[PDB]
Design a protein around this nucleic acid. Structure first.
Ligand SMILES: Cc1cc2c(cc1C)N(C[C@H](O)[C@H](O)[C@H](O)COP(=O)(O)OP(=O)(O)OC[C@H]1O[C@@H](n3cnc4c(N)ncnc43)[C@H](O)[C@@H]1O)c1[nH]c(=O)[nH]c(=O)c1N2
Lengths: 31, 35, 154, 136, 177, 82, 42, 151, 623
RNA sequence: CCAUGAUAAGGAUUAUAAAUUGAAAGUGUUAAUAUCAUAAUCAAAAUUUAUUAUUUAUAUUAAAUAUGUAUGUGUAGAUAAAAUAAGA
């Protein structure tokens, strides 16, 4: 899932202090 | 002559107008495909 | 205290890696809790390392989940982050334990082991009745009445 | 067999923090706990709260929750060499790294007057020994 | 290689505690679902063309990566050398401690290009001020990047030139074979 | 799609400032600039790659040139053994 | 652990219906782990 | 550093034919002209009594070839190990200048041969009884001494 | 005060009975032959003076041999000329005293030669002891350095003129009272190639390292067996057992007899507040230097055996490449060669024997030639220092003709403090400084980097760096140290020689992987090798990922980049020597630690203070 | 003086899910050595002769003669070992 991977990696790059558990869940669900 | 219009100005195969890291990666991929 | 011989020093990572044998030994942890309580201060880092050790020891028997399913890009980094965070909390607890042991020694007129520093009254490592005549790490010669750190009475 | 005057890694540092880094092992017994209880009882009966205030200040300074490490932050590990077991090299590297990582240089621990610690009383006046000073 | 806890039972690896709480949790869940149904019912009731056109202020930067070397040079529009070529051997990275294989690597090219640009900026300012052309408080110099070689150091060089984008602005990125 | 300078800057007394006009005898590099916002993919990925995100924590205890030196030594050993 | 196993077995013998919770919690499951025997080689 | 000349070694064996000796001597003279310090060692010669005349003949051949090629050199002390007999030829290079071809005399060669023969005989007849294990190696060495093949 | 009491005890007009060398029993043993030891030679294996004294005693008959060693009290506790640095820091002083004790043990227990150790002025102590002992021949080595050449000349003049010394004033006396016409023999034994054997004269010597290497190619080296034979025959000479130490003195139950001498300590020499001189850093190196002569010989043999020859040149290269400063295969023999414990002739003989034994390999000759080249480079620096004379130690080097591009030597005490404490931004320079300050030794590349960074990199005076390296490095040879400092500070610009390379070039060349920097500063272990040697370039995210917070640990570089005055503030630029710094909180009273004007701040005995030193102290107090 | 056997080093892989407290260590060969079935001149009491896994600082020789020399900041290179009632 290109969109989910892009969202997770954008979260990782932009917000190092806080991780997006929502984005991680979306990625693993779409996978 | 390396200034203004140069000897290789007409012999430049690939020109891309403007990050440039993506451009460089794409050009390297095209060269890899060619070779 | 009763132990006054020469001692070697070990990295805190080694004692942290030692699980419910020395570092997480319940009797030793209860002694540390009593030391904090009798001084009337909270035991937050001790309780944090206690719950961490309980959770680790409860599931140490279980096999790890399949690493193929876990994403090396994110899951492995998250696991490393959590492990480092737990290790840092345990480091803080270890440092607090050593600091408060030194402080209680100084208050109770307890002479520590050789080359042990008690801030406030030794500041350079108390050494007494050692195998080497000279003070280690300082090369200062030592008298036979080694050092009276505290006042005589009581 | 050979005799070496080399200062080993077991050298203690008596100027970095109240407790010397790479501290010597300490044995805290119940006799020490009982003596501490007796001393605290005598001190609180006499009314001298200065030592308790100093202990509270030390605890407030050195008992704060570490911060969440950003992803990618991990302690360095020793490479897996093919030259058998470099046990001594691994031990030296680990000891050197932990000696360098002094408690004063612990960046994860929030220490100093700048940080706010919403769990402990800031000054001895807030403690219950000054109950008469906070009335009506 | 073998299992460490093979002699421990599966029901013991790990042992599930708190069995007595499951019945209470199930009954509480039933009651919560019942009251949720009740409140739901209550609510329900209620030269030309594509060829680039250059400018006299733009500096031509050449990045030539080799099999075991890399070079970064710059020239003004007139055709004068702003600064001499910076090579891996000139910087000392080719000397060793990494092997001949590491010569002309991505990181090597990146650091060589970064050093060359850092040394270029004051030299470029001095060259501009020689003819009474101040750079200004905000340094935004336009450069045309020309990359040659098709090697690992090329990626490092382009990353280095992409860095410090506040001072350097890339106008055209061209490749020469 | 001088005196006044030190009065004004009390921290700068213990440091030194390079001249922007001309290159100094000791070159010092400026901090690099990274992309706060990425237009698309393969940009944040490259930034993570260049930030050391995917770099092994293992510390280099031996140089990579040791293998090359050993290979050259073995070649010369075979040569003089011939 | 041995005491817990003995008490669990006694409870199961006394009240038969207590067998299910203890068995599901793995209190009657014996582990065959045993310390290494004596050997002059080691 | 200034380039040091390689310390070349030319192997020899007891039983080399005079053609091979001549060729090796020519090569030795060539390397001496090039300035390399050369080493001549006889590897397989049996007993030290038979390995010395061949070494002397090799020295004579090297001397003749050096005289022909104008490669002046000085021969060092001849040292006989148990397995080999070796010597070093130093050409005129650097600190020590040598303008003439110098070789040990037959008197010196005979003295060296007698000394080395005595050393080898004393070693085989004395050291071997003690330098090995007693229960089996010593008994085997005594058997070798009885057979006369302990050499 | 210790110097004053030593003078009042020994250099007294009456010379009381306690501080009097006992007379011999046999009339023949009344006279003897004396030898003077110094910091340039503390060996008994290849001492030309010792061999000559043994031969003289043998020729005279049963003449006993006596040894005297007077320490230069000034060199241990007097401040440096520029910046008030210490001379012979306690790390060096302990090594010097241990080497002296090893030499005394070697002479008194193996050779049965009584060595008398004295403290104070050599030019005062030596002639008076000559007069009192009635020595006929005084054998000593030729010192040719400032504060050593002059004292040697004074010593030989006073020996020739038979002069007694009393030290209430600076007063000399004839030999009419002593309450034979002695001769002093000064011998040259410092250089590997003995003087009068050089293929070209020193005066007409062309200034060039490669030229001297080509000269040493033709030049010969004296053997050591000739002097070893004399040393061995020295044992057959009769000795005065009354001057030898007793079992109780050896065990340390009682102090040595007052006429013999007492080895001084740090406090006696003048080192005050030792707690401020304890460096609490990680010692990454795993090799030490056991002081002594037998220890030096064992170290040489071990370095030859364990394959240490590859440190000179890698196998099958024939071309010099980057060194491995983090390795333990290097020959750490510079202290033993500078202090005279190991003789260059003995080391050369060991190298020659090893090369001959392993000559079957086709590359040992190149490594031997490299080692001989380095020894000849040391000798060349000695010769160049002799040629320069006193001009070597002046400002802008000995040759002002090469200093056209040099600035006016701006001097900043805080910059010098940070440089000498290693608080810069270059990991290579920081690691080299840490190694030098902890171990007392650092590699040639590290020394080059430090001296170039202080002189040309920062614009500070080169004498400050030279004197700091003198204070730290246990292998401090005046000529070699100052000549190398001048050469790598772009003061002596002789062509046809090694190029002066940037600190960045050295970091990229000899430490490209960064093993050395990550080992001596293990807090930087997480930084990738692309970003090491420039960690200030890292952004906030990258530095948080790699666990290196600038300003907190590993502060910003001394040389800020272009700008850096608008994007940085006092929050980022953290001070290290302010009123509320850890550096002030030391010395158990509070003066500072190790650095600028440290002798003034800590030293107990200070002689001839300077206006610059007083002004610097006042500025430090104000700031 | 019997050359012939053992040993050293030393590995293999099926057990789904429910139930059960259960249903869970296996060796060629290459090596060295040796006291056995095989080929006569010489080891076991008169032992110096150098043969890997040892007790480090409150109290230290009484029953077969039962150890006086290595304190030195525990500081190298190499070598061996294990996932076994423990807690990577
Ligand atoms: C700023 C500065 C200051 C100094 C020095 C250099 C520089 C740049 N040197 C020279 C050099 O730093 C030093 O000789 C070696 O680095 C010592 O390391 P090793 O013993 O491992 O050399 P190595 O293993 O090569 O030892 C061989 C011997 O050769 C000699 N040698 C080697 N390199 C030399 C060089 N470059 N110059 C002179 N002799 C050299 C030394 O006697 C050394 O012991 C020096 N040296 C010294 O003995 N005392 C000093 O006080 C100084 N000071």
């Amino acid at each position: 899932c290109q969109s989910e991977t892009m969202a997770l990696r954008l979260c990782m790059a932009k917000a190092g202090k806080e991780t997006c558990e929502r984005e991680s869940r979306a990625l693993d669900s779409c996978l | 002559a390396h200034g203004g219009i140069s000897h290789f100005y007409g012999r430049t195969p690939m020109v891309e107008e403007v990050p440039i890291t993506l451009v460089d990666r794409r050009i390297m991929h095209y060269v890899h495909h060619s070779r | 205290n009763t132990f006054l011989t020469s001692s070697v020093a070990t990295p805190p990572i080694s004692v942290i890696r030692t699980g419910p044998k020395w570092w997480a030994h319940p009797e030793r942890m209860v002694r540390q809790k009593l030391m904090y309580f009798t001084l009337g201060v909270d035991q937050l880092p001790l309780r944090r390392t206690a719950v961490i050790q309980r959770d680790l020891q409860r599931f140490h028997m279980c096999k790890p989940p399949p690493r193929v399913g876990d994403s090396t890009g994110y899951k492995r980094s998250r696991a490393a982050q959590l492990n480092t965070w737990y290790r840092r909390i345990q480091y803080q607890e270890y440092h607090m334990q050593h600091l408060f042991t030194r402080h209680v020694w100084g208050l109770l007129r307890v002479y520590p082991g050789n080359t042990t520093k008690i801030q406030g009254k030794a500041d350079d490592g108390y050494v007494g009745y050692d195998s080497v005549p000279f003070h280690r790490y300082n090369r200062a010669p030592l008298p036979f009445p080694a050092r009276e750190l505290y006042e005589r009475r009581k | 067999n050979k005799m070496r005057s080399k200062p080993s890694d077991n050298v203690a540092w008596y100027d970095k923090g109240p407790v010397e880094w790479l501290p010597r092992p300490v044995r805290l017994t119940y006799d020490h706990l009982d003596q501490l209880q007796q001393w605290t009882m005598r001190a609180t009966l006499d009314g001298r709260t200065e030592e308790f205030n100093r202990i509270r200040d030390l605890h407030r300074e050195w008992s704060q929750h570490p911060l969440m490490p950003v992803l990618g932050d991990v302690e360095p590990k020793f490479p897996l060499n093919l030259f058998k077991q470099n046990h001594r090299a691994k031990k030296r590297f680990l000891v050197r790294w932990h000696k360098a990582n002094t408690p004063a240089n612990w960046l994860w621990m929030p220490r100093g007057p700048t940080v706010v610690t919403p769990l402990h009383r800031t000054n001895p006046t807030q403690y219950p020994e000054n109950w008469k000073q906070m009335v009506q | 290689f073998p299992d460490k806890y093979r002699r421990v039972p599966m029901l013991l690896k790990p042992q599930q505690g708190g069995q007595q709480y499951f019945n209470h949790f199930l009954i509480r869940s039933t009651n919560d679902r019942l009251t949720q149904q009740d409140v739901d019912n209550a609510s329900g009731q209620a030269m030309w063309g594509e060829m680039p056109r250059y400018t006299s202020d733009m500096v031509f930067l050449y990045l030539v990566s080799r099999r075991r070397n890399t070079y970064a040079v710059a020239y003004t529009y007139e055709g004068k050398r702003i600064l001499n070529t910076y090579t891996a051997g000139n910087r000392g990275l080719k000397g060793g401690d990494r092997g001949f294989r590491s010569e002309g690597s991505t990181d090597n090219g990146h650091q060589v290009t970064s050093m060359y640009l850092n040394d270029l900026l004051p030299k470029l300012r001095e060259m501009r001020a020689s003819e009474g052309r101040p750079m200004g408080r905000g340094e935004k110099v336009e450069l045309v990047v020309r990359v040659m070689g098709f090697y690992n150091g090329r990626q490092g060089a382009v990353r280095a030139v992409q860095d410090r984008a506040n001072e350097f602005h890339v106008r055209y990125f061209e490749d020469i074979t | 799609v001088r005196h006044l300078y030190r009065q004004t800057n009390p921290h700068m007394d213990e440091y030194l400032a390079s001249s922007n006009s001309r290159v100094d005898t000791l070159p010092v590099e400026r901090p690099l600039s990274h992309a706060v916002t990425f237009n698309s993919d393969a940009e944040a990925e490259d930034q993570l790659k260049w930030e050391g995100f995917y770099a092994e924590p293992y510390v280099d205890q031996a140089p990579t040139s040791d293998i090359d030196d050993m290979a050259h030594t073995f070649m010369l050993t075979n040569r003089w053994h011939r | 652990f041995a005491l817990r196993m003995a008490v669990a077995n006694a409870l199961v013998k006394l009240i038969p219906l207590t067998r299910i919770p203890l068995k599901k919690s793995g209190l009657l499951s014996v582990d065959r782990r045993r310390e290494r025997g004596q050997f002059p080689g080691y | 550093r200034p380039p040091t000349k390689e310390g070349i070694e030319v192997p020899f064996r007891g039983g080399t034919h005079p053609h091979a000796v001549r060729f090796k001597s020519i090569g030795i003279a060539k390397h001496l002209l090039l300035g390399h310090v050369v080493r001549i060692n006889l590897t397989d010669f049996g007993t030290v009594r038979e390995g010395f005349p061949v070494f002397g003949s090799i020295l004579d051949e090297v001397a003749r070839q050096a005289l022909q090629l104008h490669a002046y050199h000085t021969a060092g002390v001849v040292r006989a190990n148990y397995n080999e007999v070796y010597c070093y030829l130093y050409p005129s290079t650097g600190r020590s200048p040598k303008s003439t071809v110098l070789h040990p005399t037959q008197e010196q060669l005979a003295t060296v041969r007698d000394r080395c023969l005595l050393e080898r005989e004393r070693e085989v007849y004395f050291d071997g009884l003690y330098d090995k294990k007693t229960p089996r190696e010593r008994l085997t060495y005594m058997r070798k001494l009885q057979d006369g093949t302990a050499w | 005060n210790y110097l004053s009491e030593q003078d009042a005890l020994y250099l007294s007009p009456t010379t009381p009975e306690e501080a009097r060398v006992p007379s011999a029993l046999c009339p023949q043993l009344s006279a003897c032959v004396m030898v003077v030891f110094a910091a340039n030679d503390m060996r008994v294996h290849d001492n030309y003076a010792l061999a000559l004294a043994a031969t003289r005693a043998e020729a005279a008959g049963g003449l006993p041999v006596i040894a005297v060693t007077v320490v230069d009290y000034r060199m241990f506790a007097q401040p440096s000329a520029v910046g008030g640095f210490f001379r012979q820091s306690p790390m060096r002083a302990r090594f010097f005293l241990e080497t002296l004790a090893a030499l005394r043990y070697k002479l008194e227990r193996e050779l049965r030669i009584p060595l008398l150790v004295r403290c104070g002025r050599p030019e005062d102590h030596i002639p008076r002891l000559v007069v009192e002992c009635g020595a006929i021949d005084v054998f000593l080595t030729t010192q040719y350095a400032p504060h050593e050449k002059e004292v040697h000349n004074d010593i030989v003049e006073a020996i020739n003129q038979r002069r007694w010394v009393s030290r209430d004033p600076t007063a000399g006396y004839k030999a009419i009272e002593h309450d034979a016409a002695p001769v002093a023999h000064s011998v040259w034994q410092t250089t590997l190639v003995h003087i009068d054997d050089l293929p070209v004269p020193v005066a007409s010597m062309v200034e060039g390292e490669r030229w001297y290497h080509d000269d040493v190619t033709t030049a010969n080296i004296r053997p050591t067996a000739a002097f070893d034979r004399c040393i061995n025959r020295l044992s057959d000479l009769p000795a005065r057992g009354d001057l030898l130490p007793t079992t109780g003195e050896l065990s340390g139950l009682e102090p040595p007899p007052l006429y013999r001498g007492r080895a001084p300590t740090l406090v006696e020499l003048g080192y005050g507040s030792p707690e401020a001189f304890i460096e609490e850093e990680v010692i990454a190196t795993q090799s030490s230097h056991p002081p002594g002569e037998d220890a030096a010989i064992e170290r040489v043999l071990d370095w030859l055996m364990d394959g240490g020859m590859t440190s000179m040149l890698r196998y099958g290269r024939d071309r010099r490449t980057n060194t491995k400063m983090y390795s333990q295969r290097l020959s750490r023999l510079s202290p033993y060669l500078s202090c005279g414990a190991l003789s260059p002739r003995r080391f050369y003989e060991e190298l020659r024997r090893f090369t001959s034994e392993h000559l079957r390999d086709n590359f040992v000759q190149q490594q031997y030639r490299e080692a001989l080249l380095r020894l000849s480079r040391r000798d060349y620096w000695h010769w160049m220092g002799l040629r320069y004379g006193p001009l070597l130690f002046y400002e802008y080097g000995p040759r002002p003709e090469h200093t056209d591009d040099i600035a006016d030597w701006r001097h900043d005490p805080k910059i010098v403090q940070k440089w000498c404490a290693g608080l810069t931004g270059i990991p290579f320079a920081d690691a080299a400084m840490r190694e030098l300050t902890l171990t007392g030794f650092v590699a040639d590349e590290g020394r080059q980097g430090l001296i170039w960074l202080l002189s040309r990199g920062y614009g500070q005076d080169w004498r400050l760096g030279a004197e700091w390296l003198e204070r730290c490095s246990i292998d401090y040879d005046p000529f070699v140290c100052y000549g190398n400092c001048a050469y790598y500070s772009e003061l002596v610009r002789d062509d046809f020689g090694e190029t002066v390379r940037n600190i960045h070039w050295l970091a990229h060349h000899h430490d490209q992987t960064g093993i050395y920097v990550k080992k001596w500063l293990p807090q930087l272990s997480k930084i990738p090798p692309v970003y090491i040697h420039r960690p200030h370039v890292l952004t906030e995210r990258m530095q948080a990922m790699h666990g290196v917070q600038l300003g907190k640990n590993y502060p910003y570089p001394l040389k800020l980049w272009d700008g850096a005055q608008y994007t940085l503030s006092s929050e980022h630029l953290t001070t290290y020597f302010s009123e509320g710094s850890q550096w002030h909180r030391k010395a158990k009273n509070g003066a500072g630690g190790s650095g600028y004007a440290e002798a003034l701040r800590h030293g107990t005995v200070i002689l001839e203070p300077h206006q610059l030193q007083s002004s610097a102290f006042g500025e430090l107090e104000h700031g």
